[PDB]
């Protein structure tokens, strides 16, 4: 009988190319010399792990990797190469020796010298991602370091500044500095939530005019008509005209990109929003008529656009290739009369649809969307007050052949029990799920394919009713993501000891968890009488995490806005030290060095890092 090793080398390379998990690649590289060579010649993506001081011991075996990620090197966020350091240039040379075939690069750009020394090492580079969560260095003019990058990165095809903090004035200046660079760009990602204010109308016009060959354009814009220079009708017209070849257009208000629901939800804002954006249905028709190649559309605004149904009807005819639509605060999405379909219900080619804050949407409109968009695989609804478990269940039944990823959030009449009841038709078919842990809504069973669950819960609420809500039998549930949000400076001390993480022992295959408590606002050390400080809340939320057999954990400590700290406390670190099964542990905040030394006591813990990937990142390092 033929064994695997007797197969031709081409077939073996094809087989090795199918191993995408890095751990399995490392395991396969140890099987034998032939397998070592195959794995090394086949590996294409590498995220560098190690310390900057050890860069001279860098391995030279990864000669075939085309994507290199230098942004996670330790210490996190530190300048990889400083001009003040005398042997800095050598470092760049070292990189070009270790990874000569790099065409995609991701780097942390704290210092402009790091860019100027590392980026030009690969003249054939075509994709670049800049990462910076620290403060923008003071410069004489806007876009100075971006202009330098343009100077040393002529043949770039893709530029990714979605995690790169800068002033919105930097991008258009750099793009207009060198027309040939901007003309060669095919993808431009400016969807940065950290921008204080999004791009203005003039900035958007300049950016689109400079780059006519864009296929992908993402940007965080200022759509609020209160401010001067807000992006509006002419900005959208200019986007459509200047970039006819767009395949992806993702325009979002900056507040819409915030993780905190109090920043974009009109209900949570204290009267903010609630007014019309300077966008009309006729101009939306004009824009959609000018983008025939559009395949993905996202317009997540924090201001209202009403009677947009006629505009969305044009999408079906003028955009045949459109498969994904994401709308934010668009009204009149589906207003069916008698039995006629209209609005987004006309778009039969949709495979993904995200809906947020539609006041007009009733059960009839939801059923109309389910009927018309019969190809939907992903559905996302946020903040619809009038929809009911009846309409959601009917929509799920109508889409029982394709729907596999459902999210229901901030729906007044749809709580946790309501959402789990509404997803009954696709209970055995749904793969990814998000529900809000709303326990006080006033009203066989095996989740066979459910692999991922996302939860949102208010601060101080318990996780115990989850199994009673309907999530009982989930044999395939591997990853759960829990996001907690709220201001606990006004909450009283809870009468229950623990949040209830031990409830997750009900799911046997659960191994990965995201516990995002970073949108909890409380008192760092001086909580008044009847309240508890952030350490006690961390205890409340992290108790029992040791009993879970988690192999990966991403934890976001709660923050004190007045003191401006996201710190991991002594009790929280002690609780995390009980997780003997952890393979990867990433803390999104700051922690004492003794706390980081605590976690190396865990035997199997390989990847540990403090990642301050929020703006502004602490400068104390």
């Amino acid at each position: 009988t033929t064994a695997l090793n007797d197969l031709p080398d081409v077939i073996l390379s094809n087989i090795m190319a199918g191993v995408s998990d890095v751990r399995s690649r490392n395991s396969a590289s140890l099987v034998c010399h032939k397998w070592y060579l195959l794995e090394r010649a086949t590996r294409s993506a590498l995220t560098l792990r190690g310390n900057i001081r050890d860069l001279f011991m860098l391995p030279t075996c990864f000669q075939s990797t085309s994507h290199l990620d230098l942004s996670l090197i330790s210490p996190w966020g530190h300048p990889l190469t400083s001009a003040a350091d005398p042997d800095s240039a050598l470092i760049g040379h070292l990189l070009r020796h270790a990874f000569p075939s790099v065409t995609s690069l991701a780097i942390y750009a704290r210092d402009p010298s790091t860019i100027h020394i590392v980026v030009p090492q690969w003249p054939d580079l075509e994709r670049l991602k800049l990462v910076r969560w620290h403060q923008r260095p003071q410069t004489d003019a806007a876009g100075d370091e971006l202009k330098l990058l343009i100077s040393e990165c002529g043949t770039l095809k893709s530029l990714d500044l979605s995690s790169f903090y800068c002033w919105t004035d930097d991008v258009p200046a750099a793009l207009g500095s060198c027309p040939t660079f901007a003309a060669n760009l095919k993808s431009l990602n400016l969807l940065n939530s950290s921008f204080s204010e999004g791009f203005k109308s003039d900035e958007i016009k300049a950016i689109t005019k400079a780059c006519p060959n864009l296929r992908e354009f993402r940007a965080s814009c200022m759509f609020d008509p209160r401010y001067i220079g807000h992006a509006g009708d002419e900005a959208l017209v200019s986007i459509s005209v200047n970039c006819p070849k767009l395949e992806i257009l993702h325009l979002a208000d900056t507040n819409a990109l915030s993780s905190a629901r109090s920043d974009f939800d009109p209900d949570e804002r204290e009267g903010l929003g609630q007014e019309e954006a300077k966008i009309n249905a006729a101009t939306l028709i004009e824009v959609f008529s000018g983008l025939p190649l559009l395949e993905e559309l996202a317009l997540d605004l924090c201001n209202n656009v009403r009677d947009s149904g006629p505009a969305l009807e044009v999408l079906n005819s003028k955009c045949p290739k459109l498969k994904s639509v994401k709308l934010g605060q668009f009204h009149g999405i589906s207003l069916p009369v008698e039995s006629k379909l209209d609005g987004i219900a006309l778009c039969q080619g949709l495979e993904s649809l995200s809906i947020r804050n539609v006041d007009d949407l009733t059960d009839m409109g939801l059923i109309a969307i389910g009927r018309g968009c019969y190809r939907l695989a992903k559905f996302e609804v946020y903040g619809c007050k009038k929809i009911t478990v009846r309409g959601m269940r009917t929509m799920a039944s109508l889409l029982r052949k394709t729907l596999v990823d459902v999210k229901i959030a901030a729906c007044k009449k749809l709580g946790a029990v309501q959402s789990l009841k509404a997803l009954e038709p696709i209970q055995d078919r749904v793969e990814r799920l998000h529900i809000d842990c709303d326990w006080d809504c006033p009203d066989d069973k095996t989740w066979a394919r459910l692999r991922y669950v996302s939860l949102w819960i208010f601060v101080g609420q318990l996780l115990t009713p989850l199994v009673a809500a309907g999530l009982n039998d989930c044999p395939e549930l591997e990853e759960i993501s829990i996001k907690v949000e709220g201001d606990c400076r006004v909450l009283s001390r809870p009468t229950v000891r623990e949040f209830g993480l031990t409830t997750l022992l009900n799911y046997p295959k659960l191994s990965r968890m995201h516990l995002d408590c970073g949108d909890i606002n409380g008192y760092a050390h001086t909580a008044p009488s009847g309240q508890m400080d952030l350490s006690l809340w961390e205890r409340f939320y992290l108790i029992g995490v040791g009993h879970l057999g988690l192999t990966e954990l991403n934890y976001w400590p709660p923050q004190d806005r007045d003191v401006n700290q996201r710190s991991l406390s002594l009790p929280a670190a002690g609780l995390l030290q009980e997780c003997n099964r952890l393979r990867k542990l990433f803390i999104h905040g700051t922690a004492h060095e003794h706390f980081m030394m605590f976690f190396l006591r865990i035997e199997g813990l390989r990847d540990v890092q403090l990642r301050a990937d929020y703006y502004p990142a602490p400068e104390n390092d």
């Binding site: 395991s27 099987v31 034998c32």
Partner: protein
């Protein structure tokens, strides 16, 4: 419709549609000569392997055409192809390797990719000793070489 016969290495003959046989680039290539009508011989393919090959090809061409047709809410086969691909690939290792070799011969890109991905999925989640045991591979690494490779692998985020 045009029909063609394929001769396996053991002398068996399979009569099938021309269009489904067009999936194999090699068969499409030998179509250019007279052997299209005299019978295409496959000296490196056995009867069972050939039967599995033309079964997979027939299902793909059919559902392909089927999807070339239908009007609304009817492409659910896409998952079926998948589900059927998943249950089809529930074969023993020897038949799997023979299928890989036949796919490489006949140049059926889809079947070759699916079988290679099946092998890659079999690889995932196994220690080097487990991989060596499953695929019957001898370890030629000295402990110093193993430690050097591990040191190199420590430079990659997992």
């Amino acid at each position: 419709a045009k029909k063609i016969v394929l001769k396996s290495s053991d002398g068996e003959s399979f009569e099938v549609e021309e269009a489904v046989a067009l999936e194999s680039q090699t068969i499409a290539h030998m179509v250019e000569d007279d052997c299209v009508d005299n019978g295409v011989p496959l000296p490196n393919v056995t009867s069972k392997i050939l039967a599995k090959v033309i079964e997979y090809c027939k299902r793909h061409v059919e559902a392909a055409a089927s999807k070339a047709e239908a009007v609304e809410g009817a492409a659910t086969s896409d998952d079926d192809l998948k589900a059927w691909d998943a249950d089809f690939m529930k074969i023993d290792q020897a038949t799997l390797f023979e299928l890989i070799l036949a796919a490489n011969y006949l140049n059926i890109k889809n079947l070759l990719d699916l079988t290679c991905q099946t092998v890659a999925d079999m690889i995932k989640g196994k220690t080097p000793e487990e991989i060596r045991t499953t695929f019957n591979i001898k370890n030629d690494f000295t402990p110093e070489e193993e430690e050097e490779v591990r040191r190199e692998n420590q430079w990659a985020f997992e």
